[PDB]
Symmetry: C2
Subunit: 592 residues, 2 copies
Amino acid sequence: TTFSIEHDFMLDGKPFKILSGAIHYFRVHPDDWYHSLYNLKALGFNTVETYVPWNLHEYREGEFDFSGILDIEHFLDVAEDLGLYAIVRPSPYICAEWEFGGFPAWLLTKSMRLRTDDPNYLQAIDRYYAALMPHLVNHQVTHGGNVLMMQVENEYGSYGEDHDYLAALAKLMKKHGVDVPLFTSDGPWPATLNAGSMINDGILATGNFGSAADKNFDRLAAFHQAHGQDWPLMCMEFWDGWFNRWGEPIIRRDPDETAEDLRAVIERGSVNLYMFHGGTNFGFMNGTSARKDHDLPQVTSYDYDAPLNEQGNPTPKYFAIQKMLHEVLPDIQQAEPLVKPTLAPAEHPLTAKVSLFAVLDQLAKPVAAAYPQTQEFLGQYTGYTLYRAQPLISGTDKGTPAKLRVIDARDRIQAYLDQHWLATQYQEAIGDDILLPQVEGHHQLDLLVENMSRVNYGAKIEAITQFKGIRTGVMVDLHFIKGYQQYPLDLNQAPELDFSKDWQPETPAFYKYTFDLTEPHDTYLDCRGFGKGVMLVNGVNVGRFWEKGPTLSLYVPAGLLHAGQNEVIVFETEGRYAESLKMADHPIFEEP
Amino acid sequence: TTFSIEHDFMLDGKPFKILSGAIHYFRVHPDDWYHSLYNLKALGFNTVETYVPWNLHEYREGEFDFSGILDIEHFLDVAEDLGLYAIVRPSPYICAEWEFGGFPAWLLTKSMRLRTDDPNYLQAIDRYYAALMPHLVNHQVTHGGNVLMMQVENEYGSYGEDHDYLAALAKLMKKHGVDVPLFTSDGPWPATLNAGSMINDGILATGNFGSAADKNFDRLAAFHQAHGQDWPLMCMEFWDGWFNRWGEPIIRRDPDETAEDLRAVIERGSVNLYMFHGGTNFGFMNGTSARKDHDLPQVTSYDYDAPLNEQGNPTPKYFAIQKMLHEVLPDIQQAEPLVKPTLAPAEHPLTAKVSLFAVLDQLAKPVAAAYPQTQEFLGQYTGYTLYRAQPLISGTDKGTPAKLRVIDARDRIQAYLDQHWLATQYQEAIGDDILLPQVEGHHQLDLLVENMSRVNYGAKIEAITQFKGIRTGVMVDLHFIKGYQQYPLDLNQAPELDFSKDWQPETPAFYKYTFDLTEPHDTYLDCRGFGKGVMLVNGVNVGRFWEKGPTLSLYVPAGLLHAGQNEVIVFETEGRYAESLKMADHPIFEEP
């Protein structure tokens, strides 16, 4: 296969229209890759597109992983065998409604200005690319594979205008053997395109939008023409749905209107559906939005109201788009989409339960320090961090109870004295006075701090709030306390816990539901009756839950289950839990 | 003279009651030191007390100054010659309602945790003490001088409980030859005393309070006794007035009640009046209070409703205290206090005026950078910093005006495009959208940023907001801009400015009032008719003004004036100025 960019995309010397769909391999169990890709082919599309998440492939510095759900080579193979081409977007920053926009948390511990011409930043990318690009180079069409082109950065005109950065990053990609055509994507209007594109370097600029295709392509064309380029018009992200956030209602886009809006793109050029199949933000990898200085975390589900639902099954939107495509491009071969079944509903009794405080040393090796550090400096890049102190409590000026204040912490703190709950503070409320029990002497202060994920877009990508944990300290009366034990909790140790140890009410705890399955199928965990936390299925954290809503369940793919004895462990922080774990055949929702 | 601490203070073998008054040499023109000290002796007091401000003595790292108003040796000499003893408090942190509580701003550029057992912190103190302590050592009573005692830290129980820090600091003081008795001062209640005192090291703990002397001395005594110490009770700060902040009304404490409250201290032990004579926060050296995350800057005047007013003249409170002391201790010799005159009122016409933008290169050598730094990294530790960029302005998504946002800046920003005012944002408002003119191409963006002073007490001493200037960047539309010229303005160059250059309305500008005086006297500059800024008298910045109030004038001592041709230069940022500078014989006030 040959691929180059002229007036049209030229594939094997012939004008080509790219019909792409976004599937993030890292958001879908590898057992279901074939399924989703097949359904992309069945729609009538010729290409699949995916980001590459730096913060999963190099979760810890120097510890690379390209196995299982991170095996991008196998992903691209399955696509090729189904006769799909591919677009890869291996930017250090991917946005993607994803923890820190894809940046590894350990970058925060370095002296480094992200998304700029910073030598330490570019070097770290160089070292990342040394591990990644061997898994991509030979998948290029130039090496007999199916990868047509690769993106430089991601919507950089929506963050900066450092052109030396873009040029340096492109050079890095080429140095690691990327010889396929390169491109940028941006909002299709002058300010973003001027700042974000590499048009003066002869590199194709594309546009991201979800409507008004004529308006947007007109501006994109105008930009091309102003730089004397004769290029194809491609919507590199056609937002055919939207993401959801905790406490905000679900956003639903009419299937047929979506098709109509997509029609106008296809008439005038190429397109990539964002998303085609969205899948799931497993573990702690959800992203976070920011309005001014206020953060708004995104939910576990990345359904995205996409053509395929979270599970991977076809929606009315899929069929409306399939119908529309056959009207506009009748020669494209189509097929019926595959549909996966769901487990029959069931309820499983509580097997055992144990409090966090009882099993602390199975979860983490404590780091002693005079004063506290954020989790990144403890070598923890996601999840929960417990800070323990033994503060002296003593009489106050006015005789009233001594005030506890947490100074400079994110995102959510729970405070305990002698393992009894005092207060819960979220974001801006952190720093408000917490009245201590009127007691005497030294007492055990516990602060469980949750990282609810780092902002993935906009001004706050490098905000001081991107550091998670306690940054400054904790005050009793008028003084900062000294002497902490810092527990970076690894909840992936949850299956090794000794549940025969004690449980206490109104306390973070683990709850085990052990149960037998005759045959594994896709299913939904009902999270109603639990307060807040995460759930692990056979040792794998499938994501967060919160009574706040609107999502009140967790998708669990069949691949995480097996015939025989299965195990779900719930980590729950509010003290609200269910006597039986219910599994349902549909996703549960509530109005927030 | 001999001095030691037993049940009483022992001076020359005999029980001694310390009657001290706080006079900050650095807040009073050296010509008026004799005056203020004389009035302290005339009150019937035997001792004077002063802080030592690290951030004036070592304003820039390695540049020590002990001359003029910073000549502590001459200060202590004048006191001795008047037959006063002295207490010096040479802590790195002095609080004192003073810029950064006395810490040099360049400490922020170092890797260092303030007021803790940090080796880099202690080292920097060691180096400071190498320069300072030679100016103190020989003034000790042990070397024939008049200094009785010296404080370790300042109200450390109102910040931390790191005892290794206190012990290390005491050791530093002794290493530099401090052999006089040491003490700590704190709020007189267990929590502060437990955290802050050095009682277990045999070092006297004292208490700070402004009322309820029996309640407070009872707690202080109880603390002493609990550690098996038999010690004198001393109020190391008797708050006999209070400080003021911009936008808050003046606080006035009844003269006679003050005397009564002070009586109860003197009956039971020793005392130091805070303040006896408060004087003036010259230049930019005012302090700042914090409530949670919200900063509240203190005013230029440090009148403090003290026995001596800002000028140094005796108030009803002085006389009430003098009377009270003669009742309780009739043998103490007293005298009539000295009273200084004031200039007769006058008005001086505007001589010349010039805009800041016209004289930028006389004020500062610009530092070029791709991205902005806070003033500390530019070598500027107080005052105003102008950031200049040349951002490309171009069409937006919706066609509406492009939004300007300042990301992470403190304390107050003024934005201009092509030297025309756009917006002014204070503290929390910084980051709100500023609508740019609907224009095209590159344009000059100017951001004048004011440091209104770093927090001097409490949780925020090491807050990220203690960095002044632009920390993160400036956004146009969705992108951070690249390319700044950074001007660290030195307003002390104001007399060298070429005023024949152009002036423009609604623009930061300098306004010169040149005028003749037959004989110099103390006076007040009337700041009504000016918006906000500072005033320099014969090249010396006498402090800030603001129409906000309640203080609407600036005290000017006679020592800053001379017979012949004098010069006042106003730097004013809002665009509101007076055609004539009025000088009044009393301080002007307005209701905020």
